[PDB]
Amino acid sequence: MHVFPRYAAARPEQAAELVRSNPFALVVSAVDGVPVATHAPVILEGDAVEGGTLLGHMNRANPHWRSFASSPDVLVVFSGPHGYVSPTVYATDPAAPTWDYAAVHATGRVELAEDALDVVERTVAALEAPRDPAWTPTPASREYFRALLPGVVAFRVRVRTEQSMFKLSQDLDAERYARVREAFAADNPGLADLMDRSL
């Protein structure tokens, strides 16, 4: 998780946009000295990642959460769009490939969430609200949710350290940049949209 100056966020607001737009995160902790990772929806409470709170849930029968007891520092990785950059795109004889991407890394202490229902219900609102149509939990769904609670574990993470990666070829020259962006405009509109938000 090293970040060059050139591939940094322009406004610290950029990290939170990425977080809110890509909630299917990776929750990582040191179970017994070895990294263990769960894929889970995690949402952001607050305006900023640093000094904000993340909220997530996983399967209770997923034993990963039982090792949150010690409350070790965890890493939550949010992954935005990404894409391979082939030298055939550059069309230059001395060249080397790379991979373009955006990511937000949040490190902090995890604790177990009191109100699992709040967490899951807020996770619903977070994901369904930009979708059209927005799924709004029916009362019977809220009752269904109530019945599913014994099978979920929710958690919180107080973000102690945030770190953002916006590796969008912006160190390239004007000519090689154009080929990269136009090549991604075709096949990877999320990535190409991001190369514009970096200018």
Report the interface residues with ligand HEM, using CB under 6 A. Answer: 2, 38, 40-41, 57-59, 62, 84, 96-99, 120, 123-124, 127, 145, 148-149, 151-152
55 in Cβ contact with 119 (< 8 Å)? yes
Residue 41's beta-bridge partner residues? 24
**Quick one: which segment of 5-13, 48-56, 120-128, 184-192 binds a copy of itself (CB under 8 A)?**
120-128
> Given the complex with a copy of itself, which of 2 and 47 has the nearer CB atom?
2
Least CB distance from residue 114 to a copy of itself, whole Å? 21
Residue 80's nearest CA partner among 51, 97, 100, 98 is: 100
188 binds, among ligand HEM, a copy of itself, none (CB under 5 to 8 A by kind): none
Distance CA 180, CA 186 (A): 10
80 in Cβ contact with 65 (< 8 Å)? no
Contacts with a copy of itself by CB under 8 A: the residue count is: 55
143 binds, among ligand HEM, a copy of itself, none (CB under 5 to 8 A by kind): a copy of itself
Least CB distance from residue 171 to a copy of itself, whole Å? 13
151 binds, among ligand HEM, a copy of itself, none (CB under 5 to 8 A by kind): ligand HEM
Distance CA 103, CA 15 (A): 8
Q: Please list, in sequence order, all residues whose beta carbon lies within 8 angstroms of the beta carbon of residue 158, skipping any fewer than 6 positions away.
A: 53, 108, 109, 111
Q: Please list, in sequence order, all residues whose beta carbon lies within 8 angstroms of the beta carbon of residue 76, skipping any fewer than 6 positions away.
A: 25, 26, 27, 28, 42, 54, 56, 105, 106, 107, 157
105 in Cβ contact with 77 (< 8 Å)? yes
Least CB distance from residue 24 to a copy of itself, whole Å? 5
Residue in the structure block whose two tokens are 């991407």: 101
Least CB distance from residue 127 to ligand HEM, whole Å? 5
Binding site for a copy of itself (CB under 8 A): 1-2, 24, 26, 28-30, 33-39, 41, 59, 61-64, 72-75, 77, 79, 82, 84, 86-88, 93-97, 99, 101, 103, 105, 107, 124, 127-128, 131, 133, 135, 138, 140-141, 143-145, 148, 165
